[PDB]
């Protein structure tokens, strides 16, 4: 497969098929136990991070890579400066998405700037069945994928998502990882940075700049967490 | 000399000196994750292989950064990261949160190399498990289309790895079997009585 996309230019992952029902009734236990959805516009640059309460069971960290865009945009040096310390519970998760150039070695100093280590490697493999480009100066290999970086700080699913490739200047990440992420029922306090519009989900926070409307309210958001339900993982039933 | 070439040794005590530079040097390190200690990792004598081109490195599990480290302590730079999805042969895919679907297998550059053939492959591989810890194949065809008819060198391999323009390191291999005149010459020298 890689001495025929040299000849075709099909993507070996081109090639890949096929890409326990109970994963629905987990599945329906995510959606009962979710959050309604909430949201604010912010400048994630100005904005201090700390009036986001409480702390989060789950981060999920997608900054605007330059490298998005070949074809404000936040450099690794602005990523690094992120007090999400200041902001992840004792026991929490976060799930950074580092590109495929550098950001796969300062996305792990990140990491271990902010207390995680690193325990799972997802990698976006992305088809170009639809259409059989311009090379990094860096690059060795023409660049395929993406990888989410997985980091726990404190005491089902397959490592891969295979989904074609977006058009030129997409810059969504596939909606599957919110699933890997449900599927794991860390806790229920979930925070997307750098999400916008059309990421808003039930059962997260949703801070960028780009978000058009805001319903954020820190008392009316930590009330969801209050006593009994501090301590649900997301994924079993409502406390009556 | 173009056939292939090995040399059954321990890594850590033969003198890789003799061996010359390589335009690619592959590693697939028997990670503590026989292995070998951090230290002894740390300690390979990998930048006298190389004064311009790439390594490749297989890495797992914490290695992941480990790996990252002894690749920067060496003298590389990490430019790229090779991951093989593992299937069957029906093209199916087959740490403790998530199950392993891939392997990486990082890339590093050293010096300034010259005329290779950049952006022929992609940084993904799709081929099947045939045994246990063994490596895919089409790792060598790509190797190949980007620095064709260089020499290579490979640490860590089995008798299966040998392959033409490759001299196999590892403690599997079946005795020491060498073309190059250089490289019999200051094996030779180096070891007269043939005993690393
Ligand atoms: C693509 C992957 C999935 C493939 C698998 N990999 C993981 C992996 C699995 C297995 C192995 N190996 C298994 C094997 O059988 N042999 C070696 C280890 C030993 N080896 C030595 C070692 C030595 N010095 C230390 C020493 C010597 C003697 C006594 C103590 C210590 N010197 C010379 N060769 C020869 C090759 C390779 C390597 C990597 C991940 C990615």
Not at chain 1, 5 to 13: A, E, K, W
Not at chain 1, 57 to 77: A, G, M, N, Q, S
Not at chain 2, 26 to 48: Q, S
Not at chain 2, 90 to 111: A, F, P, S, T
């Given at each position: 497969?890689?001495?025929?996309?040299?000849?075709?230019?099909?993507?070996?992952?081109?090639?890949?098929?096929?890409?326990?029902?109970?994963?629905?009734?987990?599945?329906?236990?995510?959606?009962?136990?979710?959050?309604?959805?909430?949201?604010?516009?912010?400048?994630?640059?100005?904005?201090?991070?700390?009036?986001?309460?409480?702390?989060?069971?789950?981060?999920?960290?997608?900054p605007p890579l330059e490298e998005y865009y070949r074809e404000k945009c936040w450099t690794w040096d602005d990523i690094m400066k992120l007090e999400i310390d200041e902001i992840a519970a004792?026991?929490?998760?976060?799930?950074?998405?580092?590109?495929?150039?550098?950001?796969?070695?300062?996305?792990?100093?990140?990491?271990?700037?902010?207390?995680?280590?690193?325990?799972?490697?997802?990698?976006?493999?992305?088809?170009?069945?639809?259409?059989?480009?311009?090379?990094?100066?860096?690059?060795?290999?023409?660049?395929?994928?993406?990888?989410?970086?997985?980091?726990?700080?404190?005491?089902?699913?397959?490592?891969?998502?295979?989904?074609?490739?977006?058009?030129?200047?997409?810059?969504?990440?596939?909606?599957?990882?919110?699933?890997?992420?449900?599927?794991?029922?860390?806790?229920?306090?979930?925070?997307?940075?750098?999400?916008?519009?059309?990421?808003?989900?039930?059962?997260?926070?949703?801070?960028?700049?780009?978000?058009?409307?805001?319903?954020?309210?820190?008392?009316?958001?930590?009330?969801?967490?209050?006593?009994?339900?501090?301590?649900?993982?997301?994924?079993?039933?409502?406390?009556? | 000399?173009?056939?292939?070439?090995?040399?059954?040794?321990?890594?850590?005590?033969?003198?890789?000196?003799?061996?010359?530079?390589?335009?690619?040097?592959?590693?697939?390190?028997?990670?503590?994750?026989?292995?070998?200690?951090?230290?002894?990792?740390?300690?390979?004598?990998?930048?006298?292989?190389?004064?311009?081109?790439?390594?490749?490195?297989?890495?797992?599990?914490?290695?992941?950064?480990?790996?990252?480290?002894?690749?920067?302590?060496?003298?590389?730079?990490?430019?790229?990261?090779?991951?093989?999805?593992?299937?069957?042969?029906?093209?199916?895919?087959?740490?403790?949160?998530?199950?392993?679907?891939?392997?990486?297998?990082?890339?590093?550059?050293?010096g300034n190399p010259q005329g290779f053939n950049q952006g022929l492959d992609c940084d993904v591989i799709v081929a099947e498990v045939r045994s246990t810890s063994h490596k895919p194949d089409?790792?060598?065809?790509?190797?190949?289309?980007?620095?064709?008819?260089?020499?290579?060198?490979?640490?860590?391999?089995?008798?299966?790895?040998?392959?033409?323009?490759?001299?196999?390191?590892?403690?599997?291999?079946?005795?020491?079997?060498?073309?190059?005149?250089?490289?019999?010459?200051?094996?030779?020298?180096?070891?007269?009585?043939?005993?690393?």
């Amino acid at each position: 497969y890689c001495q025929h996309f040299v000849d075709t230019g099909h993507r070996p992952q081109n090639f890949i098929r096929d890409v326990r029902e109970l994963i629905r009734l987990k599945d329906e236990l995510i959606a009962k136990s979710n959050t309604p959805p909430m949201y604010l516009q912010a400048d994630i640059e100005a904005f201090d991070i700390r009036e986001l309460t409480p702390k989060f069971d789950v981060i999920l960290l997608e900054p605007p890579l330059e490298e998005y865009y070949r074809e404000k945009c936040w450099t690794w040096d602005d990523i690094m400066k992120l007090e999400i310390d200041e902001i992840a519970a004792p026991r929490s998760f976060i799930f950074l998405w580092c590109g495929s150039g550098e950001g796969l070695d300062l996305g792990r100093v990140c990491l271990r700037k902010w207390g995680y280590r690193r325990c799972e490697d997802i990698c976006w493999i992305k088809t170009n069945k639809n259409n059989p480009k311009t090379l990094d100066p860096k690059a060795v290999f023409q660049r395929t994928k993406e990888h989410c970086l997985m980091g726990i700080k404190g005491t089902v699913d397959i490592d891969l998502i295979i989904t074609e490739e977006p058009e030129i200047g997409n810059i969504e990440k596939p909606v599957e990882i919110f699933h890997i992420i449900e599927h794991f029922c860390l806790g229920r306090r979930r925070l997307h940075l750098f999400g916008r519009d059309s990421t808003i989900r039930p059962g997260w926070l949703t801070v960028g700049p780009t978000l058009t409307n805001s319903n954020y309210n820190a008392e009316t958001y930590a009330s969801y967490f209050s006593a009994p339900n501090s301590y649900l993982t997301g994924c079993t039933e409502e406390i009556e | 000399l173009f056939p292939p070439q090995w040399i059954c040794c321990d890594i850590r005590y033969l003198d890789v000196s003799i061996l010359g530079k390589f335009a690619v040097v592959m590693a697939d390190p028997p990670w503590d994750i026989g292995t070998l200690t951090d230290d002894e990792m740390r300690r390979l004598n990998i930048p006298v292989l190389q004064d311009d081109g790439f390594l490749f490195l297989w890495v797992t599990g914490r290695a992941m950064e480990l790996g990252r480290e002894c690749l920067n302590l060496w003298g590389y730079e990490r430019v790229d990261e090779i991951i093989w999805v593992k299937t069957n042969q029906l093209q199916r895919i087959i740490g403790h949160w998530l199950n392993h679907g891939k392997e990486h297998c990082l890339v590093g550059v050293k010096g300034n190399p010259q005329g290779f053939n950049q952006g022929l492959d992609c940084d993904v591989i799709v081929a099947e498990v045939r045994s246990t810890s063994h490596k895919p194949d089409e790792i060598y065809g790509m190797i190949e289309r980007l620095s064709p008819g260089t020499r290579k060198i490979e640490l860590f391999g089995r008798p299966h790895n040998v392959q033409p323009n490759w001299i196999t390191l590892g403690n599997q291999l079946d005795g020491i079997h060498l073309l190059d005149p250089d490289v019999v010459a200051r094996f030779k020298q180096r070891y007269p009585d043939g005993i690393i």
